[PDB]
């Protein structure tokens, strides 16, 4: 588990080297603010129907009376370029503000916890996360446990015994075709099937696809090796 | 989970076949080049909005011929091979309800073209039979296979122990399943049963998506108005300045309607700009409900329908997700 | 050799999941991955 | 039963704690150990 947990940071050191697109989301940020800010500085090359768009020119050429009418132009079209920037801005900072919440809650639920949230955390189970800083932004390393190289097996919802029906406490029945077994839900691990790996409710009659099996007494062989010591006690008393 | 990608040219709107007008509308520089920008941005927006809700399943996962899924009737849900669009039965019902909506708007604005204003329709990425096979192979992962294809592979899992692996989540004992099957399948086929027919007898009941379409239909009707106003002009007719003024008399009248008809794109583009924010965090929830709801089993109270939650099942609808909450 | 070309996307891999009513894929072994994810 | 419960201090802690017995399924195995024993012991006070 720690040569693969080593393995795969090893992958992401490769992957944030290999590739420019890994941080887009983050360049595409700074892409369109600094797009944003040039087309507002390129406003300022704009007519907007003056004789023309440097103002310290129409100062020069024209006389107070005249010069007014051309300097409303340039400051009509001026202040639509602001406030078109403006709106743009408080706009995009309300996608980065909801991005940021997303990335306070994933610090909080992800760093600070371990989630139950499926795809939340990364993709599989999640075990934990990492945080790592980038320009204005943050990595995060989601760890998570995925399940590699399934068999299947044969399943039953329970087993009778005793006439009494058996369920799982925790895990699932399964069987290699010869033998029953209780197996962790996810991860194949099996076990002989016990009164302590089961749990009884109600007869074998009601629980579509039962089978039986044995369901072995762990108390059972206590009681019966403690009846061979009594039955040699007696035995032995037959012989004084 | 998206709307109408509409791209409108800011050239052809404000001063539609007109050199002169275009002549005149390079001295405001770059509004048009952003205007066009903002609404590619938004109809680029609309793909990844659909792409993050239904492409969240890597491989197409078919549904068995053989439908044993311990008494669940699911064939409500699941696709319907006989039709031509491989839709399930409540899908068609969601399509016709909400496709009365959109024909108005296709005709008003299926090989879409562009109309005199500059108003376009432009075509989804995912075709409506698209976004059904991605539903259906949710649908047909969740019911094969439980939450584990969220996980992993898909690891196969026999319905009625699944939906055991279910109960024991809502802190149910799995035998209160077994011993009930009958019953709770009875009950699933029963509430299917009702939200097919509430689908069909009801009038209010996806108003959350005849909203999107009329919001999109009704600021197109505000745009394409206000072409017709003079912004105290001559008149509100661009052939009709140049037919009867001259090269300097005419362009007094055109920079009057290049004023007032920029500014209704940049309030329409505006209008629209913030409504795109608003699908993209419906859209943003409608792909968390799909990874939480559906690819799992949700323990957050509420978040999966109003009950304990068991399962869910996503339907496509137009321009949106229908998810068929199950809870006990 | 190499040319412009236009398709029907794929949506992904097909794959019919050998589901039955009495059978149950369990995992002997696991990846354990850590993937990134990067937020403005 | 003793499995479906488990233990915790004395009665004097706990506000509202209520007087029933807890039943253990390894005493009638164990009952039935020794009826199993005693009707040999007797047995064997016979010969
Ligand atoms: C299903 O799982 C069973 C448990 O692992 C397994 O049973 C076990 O099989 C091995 C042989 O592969 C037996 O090993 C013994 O085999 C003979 C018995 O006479 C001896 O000569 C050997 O030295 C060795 O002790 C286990 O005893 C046996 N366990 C039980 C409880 O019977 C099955 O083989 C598996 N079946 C399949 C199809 O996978
Ligand atoms: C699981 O184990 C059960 C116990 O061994 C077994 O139940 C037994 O099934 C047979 C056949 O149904 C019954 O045999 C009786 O059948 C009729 C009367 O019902 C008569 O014609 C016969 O002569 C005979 O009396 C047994 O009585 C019955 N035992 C009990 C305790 O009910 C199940 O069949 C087994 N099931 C599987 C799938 O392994
Ligand atoms: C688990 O078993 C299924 C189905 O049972 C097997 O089917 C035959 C291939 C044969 O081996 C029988 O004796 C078995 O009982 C497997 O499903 C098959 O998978 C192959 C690809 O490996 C595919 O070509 C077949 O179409 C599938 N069978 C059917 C009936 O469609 C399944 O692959 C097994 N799972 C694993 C992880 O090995
Ligand atoms: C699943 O439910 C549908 C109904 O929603 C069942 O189809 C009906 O079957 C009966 C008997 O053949 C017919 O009389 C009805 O007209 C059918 N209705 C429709 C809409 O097809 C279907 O048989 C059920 N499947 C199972 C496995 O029970
Ligand atoms: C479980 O998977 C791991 C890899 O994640 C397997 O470990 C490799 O085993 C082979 C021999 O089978 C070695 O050559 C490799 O060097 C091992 N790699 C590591 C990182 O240890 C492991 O064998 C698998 N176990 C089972 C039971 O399938
Ligand atoms: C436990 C159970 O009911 N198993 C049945 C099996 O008997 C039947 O042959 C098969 C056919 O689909 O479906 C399953
Ligand atoms: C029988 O009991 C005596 C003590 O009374 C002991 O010494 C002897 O070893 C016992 N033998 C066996 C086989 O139990
Ligand atoms: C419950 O309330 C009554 C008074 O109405 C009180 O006598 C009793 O002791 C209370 N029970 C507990 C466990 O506190
Ligand atoms: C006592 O047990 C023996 C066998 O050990 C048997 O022959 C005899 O009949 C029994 N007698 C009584 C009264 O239990």
């Not at chain 1, 980065?96 to 610090?107: D, F, G, V, Y």
Request: with cysteine; hydrophobic share 40%; net charge neutral.
């Amino acid at each position: 588990i720690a040569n693969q947990f080593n393995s795969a940071i090893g992958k992401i050191q490769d992957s944030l080297s290999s590739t420019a697109s890994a941080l887009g989301k983050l360049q595409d940020v700074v892409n369109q603010n600094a797009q944003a800010l040039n087309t507002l500085v390129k406003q300022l090359s704009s007519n907007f129907g003056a004789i023309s768009s440097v103002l310290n020119d129409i100062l020069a050429r024209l006389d107070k009376v005249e010069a007014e009418v051309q300097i409303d132009r340039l400051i009509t079209g001026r202040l639509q370029s602001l406030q078109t920037y403006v709106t743009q801005q408080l706009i995009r900072a309300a996608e980065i503000r909801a991005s940021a919440n997303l990335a306070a809650t994933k610090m909080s639920e992800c760093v600070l916890g371990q989630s139950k949230r499926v795809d939340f955390c990364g993709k599989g189970y999640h075990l934990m996360s990492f945080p790592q800083s980038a320009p204005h932004g943050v990595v995060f390393l989601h760890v998570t446990y995925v399940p590699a190289q399934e068999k299947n097996f044969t399943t039953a919802p329970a087993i009778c015994h005793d006439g009494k029906a058996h369920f799982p406490r925790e895990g699932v029945f399964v069987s290699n075709g010869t033998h029953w077994f209780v197996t962790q839900r996810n991860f194949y691990e099996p076990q002989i099937i016990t009164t302590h790996n089961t749990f009884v409710s109600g007869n074998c009659d009601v629980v579509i696809g039962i089978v039986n099996n044995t369901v072995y007494d762990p108390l059972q062989p206590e009681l019966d090796s403690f009846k061979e010591e009594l039955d040699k006690y007696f035995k032995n008393h037959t012989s004084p | 989970v998206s709307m109408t990608k509409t791209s409108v040219d800011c050239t052809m709107y404000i001063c539609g076949d007109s050199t002169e007008c275009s002549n005149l509308l390079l001295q405001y520089g770059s509004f048009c080049t952003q205007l066009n920008r903002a609404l590619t941005g938004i109809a680029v927006e609309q793909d990844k909005n659909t792409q993050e809700v239904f492409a969240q399943v890597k491989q197409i996962y078919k549904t068995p011929p053989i439908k044993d899924f311990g008494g669940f009737n699911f064939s409500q849900i699941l696709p319907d091979p006989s039709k031509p669009s491989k839709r399930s039965f409540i899908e068609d019902l969601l399509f016709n309800k909400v496709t009365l909506a959109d024909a108005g708007f296709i005709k008003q604005y299926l090989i879409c073209a562009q109309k005199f204003n500059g108003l376009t329709v432009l075509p989804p990425l995912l075709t409506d039979e698209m976004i059904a096979q991605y539903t259906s192979a949710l649908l047909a992962g969740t019911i094969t296979s439980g939450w584990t294809f969220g996980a992993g592979a898909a690891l196969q899992i026999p319905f009625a122990m699944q939906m055991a692996y279910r109960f024991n989540g809502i802190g149910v004992t799995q035998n209160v399943l077994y011993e009930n099957q009958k019953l709770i399948a009875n009950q699933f086929n029963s509430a299917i049963g009702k939200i097919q027919d509430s689908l069909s007898s009801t009038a209010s009941a996806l108003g959350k998506l005849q909203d999107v379409v009329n919001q999109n239909a009704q600021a197109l009707n505000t745009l394409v108005k206000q072409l017709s106003s003079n912004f105290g002009a001559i008149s509100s007719v661009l052939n009709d300045i140049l037919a009867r003024l001259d090269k300097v008399e005419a362009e007094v009248q055109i920079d009057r309607l290049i004023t007032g008809r920029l500014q209704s794109l940049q309030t329409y583009v505006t209008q629209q700009l913030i409504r795109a924010a608003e699908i993209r965090a419906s859209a943003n929830l409608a792909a968390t409900k799909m990874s939480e709801c559906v690819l799992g089993q949700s323990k957050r109270v509420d978040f999966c329908g109003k009950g304990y939650h068991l399962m869910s099942f996503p339907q496509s609808a137009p321009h949106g997700v229908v998810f068929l909450h199950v809870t006990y | 050799s190499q040319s412009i070309i236009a398709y029907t996307m794929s949506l992904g891999a097909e794959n019919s999941v050998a589901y039955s009513n009495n059978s149950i894929a369990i995992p002997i072994n696991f990846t354990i991955s850590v993937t990134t994810e990067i937020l403005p």
